[PDB]
Design an enzyme around this catalytic site. Structure first.
Site, PDB file in Angstrom:
ATOM      1  N   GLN A 105     -25.555  59.130  82.806  1.00 42.82           N
ATOM      2  CA  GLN A 105     -24.976  58.164  82.806  1.00 42.82           C
ATOM      3  C   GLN A 105     -26.756  57.059  82.599  1.00 42.82           C
ATOM      4  OE1 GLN A 105     -23.510  55.314  85.103  1.00 42.82           O
ATOM      5  NE2 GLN A 105     -22.919  53.671  83.774  1.00 42.82           N
ATOM      6  N   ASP A 108     -28.210  58.363  79.288  1.00 37.85           N
ATOM      7  CA  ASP A 108     -27.566  57.495  78.509  1.00 37.85           C
ATOM      8  C   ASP A 108     -28.670  56.513  78.000  1.00 37.85           C
ATOM      9  OD1 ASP A 108     -26.447  55.424  77.092  1.00 37.85           O
ATOM     10  OD2 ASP A 108     -24.887  56.861  76.722  1.00 37.85           O
ATOM     11  N   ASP A 110     -31.844  55.813  79.292  1.00 40.81           N
ATOM     12  CA  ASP A 110     -32.693  55.786  78.902  1.00 40.81           C
ATOM     13  C   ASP A 110     -32.597  55.739  77.417  1.00 40.81           C
ATOM     14  OD1 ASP A 110     -35.548  57.053  78.057  1.00 40.81           O
ATOM     15  OD2 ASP A 110     -35.608  57.554  80.108  1.00 40.81           O
ATOM     16  N   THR A 184     -35.576  52.869  74.189  1.00 38.21           N
ATOM     17  CA  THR A 184     -36.679  53.767  73.232  1.00 38.21           C
ATOM     18  C   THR A 184     -35.577  54.812  73.176  1.00 38.21           C
ATOM     19  OG1 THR A 184     -37.196  54.548  75.106  1.00 38.21           O
ATOM     20  CG2 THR A 184     -38.942  53.043  74.221  1.00 38.21           C
ATOM     21  N   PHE A 186     -37.021  57.900  72.797  1.00 37.32           N
ATOM     22  CA  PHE A 186     -37.513  59.001  74.642  1.00 37.32           C
ATOM     23  C   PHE A 186     -37.608  59.067  75.070  1.00 37.32           C
ATOM     24  CE2 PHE A 186     -41.146  56.979  70.250  1.00 37.32           C
ATOM     25  CZ  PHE A 186     -40.790  58.290  69.495  1.00 37.32           C
ATOM     26  N   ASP A 188     -38.351  58.634  78.221  1.00 38.85           N
ATOM     27  CA  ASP A 188     -39.944  58.248  78.817  1.00 38.85           C
ATOM     28  C   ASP A 188     -39.990  57.172  79.886  1.00 38.85           C
ATOM     29  OD1 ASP A 188     -38.598  55.916  77.548  1.00 38.85           O
ATOM     30  OD2 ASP A 188     -39.475  55.674  75.813  1.00 38.85           O
ATOM     31  N   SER A 190     -37.844  54.527  80.406  1.00 37.40           N
ATOM     32  CA  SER A 190     -37.510  53.244  79.582  1.00 37.40           C
ATOM     33  C   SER A 190     -36.991  52.418  80.547  1.00 37.40           C
ATOM     34  CB  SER A 190     -37.020  53.206  78.175  1.00 37.40           C
ATOM     35  OG  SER A 190     -35.800  54.157  78.035  1.00 37.40           O
ATOM     36  N   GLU A 258     -24.035  47.584  86.790  1.00 35.97           N
ATOM     37  CA  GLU A 258     -23.059  47.767  86.269  1.00 35.97           C
ATOM     38  C   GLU A 258     -22.229  48.372  87.039  1.00 35.97           C
ATOM     39  OE1 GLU A 258     -21.833  51.362  85.030  1.00 35.97           O
ATOM     40  OE2 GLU A 258     -19.399  50.996  84.088  1.00 35.97           O
ATOM     41  N   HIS A 351     -17.335  59.944  80.343  1.00 38.27           N
ATOM     42  CA  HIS A 351     -16.415  58.349  80.424  1.00 38.27           C
ATOM     43  C   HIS A 351     -15.142  59.630  81.449  1.00 38.27           C
ATOM     44  CE1 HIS A 351     -18.283  55.114  78.369  1.00 38.27           C
ATOM     45  NE2 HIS A 351     -18.740  55.438  79.146  1.00 38.27           N
TER      46      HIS A 351
HETATM   47  C1  HEM Z   1     -18.426  54.034  86.271  1.00 43.34           C
HETATM   48  C2  HEM Z   1     -19.079  54.689  85.224  1.00 43.34           C
HETATM   49  C3  HEM Z   1     -19.518  54.120  83.661  1.00 43.34           C
HETATM   50  C4  HEM Z   1     -19.355  52.888  83.638  1.00 43.34           C
HETATM   51  C5  HEM Z   1     -18.354  51.347  84.162  1.00 43.34           C
HETATM   52  C6  HEM Z   1     -19.624  52.763  82.190  1.00 43.34           C
HETATM   53  C7  HEM Z   1     -18.519  50.897  81.652  1.00 43.34           C
HETATM   54  C8  HEM Z   1     -19.944  51.437  80.033  1.00 43.34           C
HETATM   55  C9  HEM Z   1     -20.035  49.946  78.979  1.00 43.34           C
HETATM   56  C10 HEM Z   1     -19.268  48.919  79.871  1.00 43.34           C
HETATM   57  C11 HEM Z   1     -20.346  50.659  78.303  1.00 43.34           C
HETATM   58  C12 HEM Z   1     -20.494  49.194  77.113  1.00 43.34           C
HETATM   59  C13 HEM Z   1     -19.284  49.861  76.119  1.00 43.34           C
HETATM   60  C14 HEM Z   1     -19.240  49.306  74.737  1.00 43.34           C
HETATM   61  O1  HEM Z   1     -19.524  47.845  74.789  1.00 43.34           O
HETATM   62  O2  HEM Z   1     -19.545  49.746  73.757  1.00 43.34           O
HETATM   63  C15 HEM Z   1     -20.804  51.721  78.135  1.00 43.34           C
HETATM   64  C16 HEM Z   1     -21.419  52.607  77.012  1.00 43.34           C
HETATM   65  C17 HEM Z   1     -21.414  54.212  77.431  1.00 43.34           C
HETATM   66  N1  HEM Z   1     -21.785  54.744  78.342  1.00 43.34           N
HETATM   67 FE1  HEM Z   1     -20.558  54.430  79.684  1.00 43.34          FE
HETATM   68  N2  HEM Z   1     -20.066  53.517  81.797  1.00 43.34           N
HETATM   69  C18 HEM Z   1     -20.160  54.480  82.969  1.00 43.34           C
HETATM   70  C19 HEM Z   1     -20.241  56.164  82.438  1.00 43.34           C
HETATM   71  C20 HEM Z   1     -21.298  56.241  81.593  1.00 43.34           C
HETATM   72  C21 HEM Z   1     -21.946  58.012  81.786  1.00 43.34           C
HETATM   73  C22 HEM Z   1     -20.785  59.114  83.034  1.00 43.34           C
HETATM   74  C23 HEM Z   1     -21.880  58.563  80.606  1.00 43.34           C
HETATM   75  C24 HEM Z   1     -22.765  59.598  80.685  1.00 43.34           C
HETATM   76  C25 HEM Z   1     -22.609  60.318  81.061  1.00 43.34           C
HETATM   77  C26 HEM Z   1     -21.920  57.483  80.263  1.00 43.34           C
HETATM   78  C27 HEM Z   1     -22.875  57.123  79.211  1.00 43.34           C
HETATM   79  C28 HEM Z   1     -22.454  55.640  77.695  1.00 43.34           C
HETATM   80  C29 HEM Z   1     -22.858  55.753  76.794  1.00 43.34           C
HETATM   81  C30 HEM Z   1     -23.728  56.291  75.630  1.00 43.34           C
HETATM   82  C31 HEM Z   1     -22.904  54.538  76.514  1.00 43.34           C
HETATM   83  C32 HEM Z   1     -22.830  54.010  74.918  1.00 43.34           C
HETATM   84  C33 HEM Z   1     -24.066  53.279  75.285  1.00 43.34           C
HETATM   85  C34 HEM Z   1     -24.609  52.532  73.706  1.00 43.34           C
HETATM   86  O3  HEM Z   1     -25.161  52.453  73.326  1.00 43.34           O
HETATM   87  O4  HEM Z   1     -24.414  51.071  74.100  1.00 43.34           O
HETATM   88  N3  HEM Z   1     -20.957  55.915  80.839  1.00 43.34           N
HETATM   89  N4  HEM Z   1     -20.218  52.170  79.565  1.00 43.34           N
HETATM   90 CA   LIG Z   2     -36.087  55.801  76.175  1.00 41.06          CA
END
Ligand code: HEM
Ligand SMILES: [Ca+2]
Ligand SMILES: *[C@@H]1O[C@H](CO)[C@@H](O[C@@H]2O[C@H](CO)[C@@H](O)[C@H](O)[C@H]2NC(C)=O)[C@H](O)[C@H]1NC(C)=O
Ligand SMILES: *[C@@H]1O[C@H](CO)[C@@H](O)[C@H](O)[C@H]1NC(C)=O
Ligand SMILES: *[C@@H]1O[C@H](CO)[C@@H](O)[C@H](O)[C@H]1NC(C)=O
Ligand SMILES: *[C@@H]1O[C@H](CO)[C@@H](O)[C@H](O)[C@H]1NC(C)=O
Ligand SMILES: [Cl-]
Length: 595
Positions: A105, A108, A110, A184, A186, A188, A190, A258, A351
Site C-alpha cells: 500500500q 502504491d 508513492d 510522482t 518515480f 522517490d 513522495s 486511511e 485488496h
Molecule cells: C486496509 C487496507 C486498505 C484500505 C482501507 C484501502 C482503501 C483504498 C481506497 C478507499 C482506495 C480508493 C478507491 C477508489 O476511489 O477508487 C484505494 C485505492 C487503491 N489501493 Fe487500497 N486500501 C488498502 C490496502 C491496499 C493495499 C495493500 C494495496 C496494494 C498492495 C492497495 C493498493 C491500492 C491502489 C493501487 C489503489 C489505487 C490508487 C490510486 O491511483 O488512486 N491498497 N484503497
Molecule cells: Ca513517487
C-alpha cells in the site's frame, strides 16, 4: 496527424543543468521530456481508453448501451456473487507477514493517486449523490441489486464521484478523458516528502538549520516522534471518535490515516528521515538545512527503492520476476517512467491480502492488553488508537508476527473492506472497496480482460469452457460468465485477480505482466535510481546494499527483537534476533572530508 495533449493545468516548467536532487514534483527527471513522471499530469495510456461514447461516459452509464452486445453487471452484484465470503478461518498466508500487505500500500501510494474530481468541497453537490442516488456529471452512484441486504439498512445506492481528469472540469473536444496522477510516478518517497512544493514546505521544520521534518508537538511516543496533526476540518479521524478528538496525520500523501498500519508505516519513514538528518549533521557540521533535508530525502528514497525491488517484488512476481525485471543495466532516457492507468487497478491486488483483524503485541510478542485484537473496520481513519493506546510499537510487532490474508478464488475481499469501509464525508462504516474498484475501472475507461490478455501475449478465452481452463476454476468461471456473458466484458480488476497465482508469487500471469512491466519502466526510466551510475558514490552504494526493514524498525522504535527477513511469516521467539546483530547503515561515506 492529431494534436498532442491538452495540459492547461500545470503550466510551470523551469529546469536545472546542475540538480543533484530530484524535484518534489518529479519534473526535470527526464532531460529531453522533463514533464514525464511529474505529478498532476495524465496517467499513461498503454492501450486506448474504452468509454461507452468513445470519449468520457463509462460503460454502464446508459441503460440501453451494451458492451460487445451485453449490459455490464452492477459493481455491487459482482462484489456480492464473487468477491464476498463469510469464514475468515484458514484464509491467512503461511509465508507472508502482514508487513507484506502494508509495504504494497506504501509503494502504491508513492506511485499513483487519481483523486475524485473537486467540484463539491463543502457544497450541496456531494449530498445530491449521497441522499438521492441520481446519476449526472461526476456523480456515478453504485446502485444495489434486487436481493442486497444493504437495501434494507442503507438506501438504494453507495455514492461514487468520477476521478479528476486533465483540462478540468467539464469535458473538451475529440480526445478520450484522461485521469490525473497527483503524485510522482518515480519511487522517490513522495509519500513522505509530498508531490507539491506547498505541501513539501509545510511538512518541513524551517526553524532550525537541521533539515528536519516537522514532528507532533501535542504528543510523543515514549520520546519518539509522531507525524504532525492535520489541523483542518471536517477531519474523518475526529468523526470516528468525537470524545478522543484525535485528528488525522499530515504526510507527503493525503491518504496516510486511511488505516492505522499505513499511518504506522508513515511514522517509521518520517522518524528515519529525522534520524538520518541528525547523523549527517554529526558527520557534516558545515552542511546547511537544505543540504541535510535533500541528502536525507535522497537516502530514504534509495531505502524505499532497495526494499521494494530486492525484498518485495520477487515475492510478488515469483518465477516471473526476471522475465520482466532483469538485472539493472543503468538509466535508459528512452523509457516511459509514467505510471499507466491500468497499473493503478493491477496494484489493487493488495485488496485481497488485507485480513479481518489487527493486533497489538507486548515486548514478549503477546496480546498487548485485553482488546489486543481489533476488527479492521474500527481502524479506518483511527489515529487515537495510536495516540491514546500504546504508540506504534505494539502495531509494528503485529506487522512482524502476524500474517497477510492469502488471495483465495473462493474468499477474495474480507467483509471489513467489502461491507464496512469508512469513506470521508460519508457517515457510515458501510461501503464496498470491491464495488468501488469495479466502478473506478469503468470510470477510467479500462479495456476489458481479453484486451489485456492480448497486450501480455496470453490466450483470450471466448467460452465458459475457455475461462474455466484459464482460471483453473469451473464455478468461478461460471459465475463470471453468468454476470458478464463474455470474458471480453470482465473488468480487468476482477479478471486479473481471479487468475491462479504464479509459482513463488502472489499474483496471476496477467497481473505479473502488467505489474512487471510498470516496475521495469519506473526503474530503467528514473535518472535518480539509487544504483544508476553518478547518483551515489561507489562507497555510499555499498552502504545502501545493507538496508533492511528489520534495521529500519530497530533504529526508529523501542523494538529490539526482529526477524532477518521481514516479509516472510516469522514466529517469536524462534525467527527473531537481537537488533545488536542486524546490519547498520554506515553513513561514513556521506562525510564530506576534503575541502
Ligand atoms: C486496509 C487496507 C486498505 C484500505 C482501507 C484501502 C482503501 C483504498 C481506497 C478507499 C482506495 C480508493 C478507491 C477508489 O476511489 O477508487 C484505494 C485505492 C487503491 N489501493 Fe487500497 N486500501 C488498502 C490496502 C491496499 C493495499 C495493500 C494495496 C496494494 C498492495 C492497495 C493498493 C491500492 C491502489 C493501487 C489503489 C489505487 C490508487 C490510486 O491511483 O488512486 N491498497 N484503497
Ligand atoms: Ca513517487
Ligand atoms: C474514544 O476514545 C476514548 C479514549 O480517548 C475511548 O475510551 C479509553 O477507552 C477505554 C474505556 O472504554 C479505557 O481503556 C480508558 O480508560 C478510556 N479513557 C477515557 C478517557 O475514556 C473510547 O472507548 C473511544 N470510543 C469509541 C467509540 O471508540
Ligand atoms: C517462503 O518464501 C520465501 C521468500 O520470501 C522462499 O524463499 C521460501 O521458499 C518460502 N518458505 C517456506 C517455509 O515455504
Ligand atoms: C524543529 O526542530 C527544533 C530543533 O530540533 C525543535 O525544537 C522544534 O520543535 C522543531 N519543530 C517542529 C515543528 O518539529
Ligand atoms: C532503451 O529503451 C528502449 C525502449 O524501451 C529500447 O528499445 C532500447 O533498446 C533500450 N536500450 C537499452 C540499452 O536498454
Ligand atoms: Cl477482534
Amino acid at each position: 496527424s492529431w494534436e498532442v495533449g491538452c495540459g492547461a493545468p500545470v503550466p510551470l516548467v523551469k529546469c536545472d543543468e546542475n540538480s543533484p536532487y530530484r524535484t518534489i514534483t518529479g519534473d526535470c527527471n527526464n532531460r529531453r521530456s522533463p514533464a514525464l513522471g511529474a505529478a498532476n499530469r495524465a496517467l499513461a495510456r498503454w492501450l486506448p481508453a474504452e468509454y461507452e461514447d468513445g470519449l468520457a461516459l463509462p460503460f454502464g452509464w446508459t441503460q440501453r448501451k451494451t458492451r460487445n452486445g451485453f449490459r455490464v453487471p452492477l459493481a455491487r452484484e459482482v462484489s456480492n456473487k464473487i468477491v464476498g465470503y463469510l469464514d475468515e478461518e484458514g484464509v491467512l498466508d503461511q509465508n507472508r507477514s502482514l508487513l507484506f500487505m502494508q509495504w504494497g500500500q506504501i509503494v502504491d501510494h508513492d506511485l499513483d493517486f487519481a483523486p475524485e474530481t473537486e467540484l463539491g468541497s463543502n457544497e450541496h453537490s456531494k449530498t445530491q449523490c449521497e441522499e438521492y442516488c441520481i446519476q449526472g456529471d461526476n456523480c456515478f452512484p453504485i446502485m444495489f441489486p434486487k436481493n442486497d441486504p444493504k437495501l434494507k439498512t442503507q438506501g438504494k445506492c453507495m455514492p461514487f464521484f468520477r476521478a479528476g481528469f486533465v483540462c478540468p472540469t467539464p469535458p473538451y473536444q475529440s480526445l478520450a478523458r484522461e485521469q490525473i496522477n497527483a503524485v510522482t510516478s518515480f519511487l522517490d518517497a513522495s509519500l513522505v516528502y509530498g508531490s507539491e512544493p506547498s505541501l513539501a514546505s509545510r511538512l518541513r521544520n524551517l526553524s532550525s538549520p537541521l533539515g528536519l521534518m516537522a514532528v507532533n508537538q501535542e504528543a510523543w511516543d515514549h520520546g519518539l516522534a509522531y507525524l504532525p496533526f492535520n489541523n483542518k476540518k471536517p477531519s474523518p479521524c475526529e468523526f470516528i471518535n468525537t470524545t478522543a478528538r484525535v485528528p488525522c496525520f499530515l504526510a507527503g500523501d493525503f491518504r496516510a490515516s486511511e488505516q492505522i498500519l499505513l499511518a504506522t508505516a508513515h511514522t517509521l519513514l518520517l522518524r528515519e528521515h529525522n534520524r538520518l538528518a541528525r547523523e549527517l549533521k554529526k558527520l557534516n557540521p558545515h552542511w546547511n538545512g537544505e543540504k541535510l533535508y535533500q541528502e536525507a530525502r535522497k537516502i530514504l528514497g534509495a531505502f524505499i527503492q532497495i526494499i521494494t525491488f530486492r525484498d518485495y517484488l520477487p515475492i510478488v512476481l515469483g518465477s516471473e520476476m526476471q522475465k520482466w525485471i532483469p538485472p539493472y543495466q543503468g538509466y535508459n532516457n528512452s523509457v516511459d517512467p509514467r505510471i499507466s492507468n491500468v497499473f493503478t487497478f493491477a496494484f489493487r491486488f493488495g485488496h485481497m491480502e488485507v485480513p479481518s483483524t489487527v493486533s497489538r503485541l507486548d515486548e514478549n510478542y503477546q496480546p498487548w492488553g485485553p482488546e489486543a485484537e481489533l476488527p479492521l473496520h474500527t481502524l479506518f481513519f483511527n489515529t487515537w488508537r495510536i495516540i491514546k493506546d500504546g504508540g506504534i510499537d505494539p502495531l509494528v510487532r503485529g506487522l512482524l508476527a502476524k500474517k497477510s490474508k492469502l488471495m483465495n478464488q473462493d474468499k477474495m475481499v474480507t467483509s471489513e473492506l467489502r461491507n464496512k469501509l469508512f469513506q470521508p464525508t460519508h457517515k457510515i462504516h458501510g461501503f464496498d472497496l470491491a464495488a468501488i474498484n469495479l466502478q473506478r475501472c469503468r470510470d477510467h475507461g479500462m479495456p476489458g480482460y481479453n484486451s489485456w490478455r492480448g497486450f501480455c501475449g496470453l490466450s483470450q478465452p471466448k467460452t465458459l469452457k475457455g475461462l474455466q481452463t484459464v482460471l483453473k476454476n469451473k464455478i468461478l468461471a461460471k459465475k463470471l460468465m453468468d454476470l458478464y456473458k463474455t470474458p471480453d466484458n470482465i473488468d480487468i480488476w476482477i479478471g486479473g485477480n481471479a487468475e491462479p497465482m504464479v509459482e513463488r508469487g502472489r499474483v496471476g500471469p496477467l497481473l505479473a505482466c502488467l505489474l512487471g512491466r510498470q516496475f521495469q519502466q519506473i526503474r530503467d526510466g528514473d535518472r535518480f535510481w539509487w544504483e544508476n551510475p553518478g547518483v551515489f558514490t561507489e562507497k555510499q552504494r555499498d552502504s545502501l546494499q545493507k538496508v533492511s526493514f528489520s534495521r529500519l524498525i530497530c533504529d526508529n522504535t523501542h523494538i529490539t527483537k526482529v526477524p532477518l527477513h521481514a516479509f516472510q511469516a516469522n514466529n517469536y521467539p524462534h525467527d527473531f534476533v537481537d537488533c545488536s546483530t542486524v546490519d547498520k547503515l554506515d553513513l561514513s561515506p556521506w562525510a564530506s572530508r576534503e575541502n
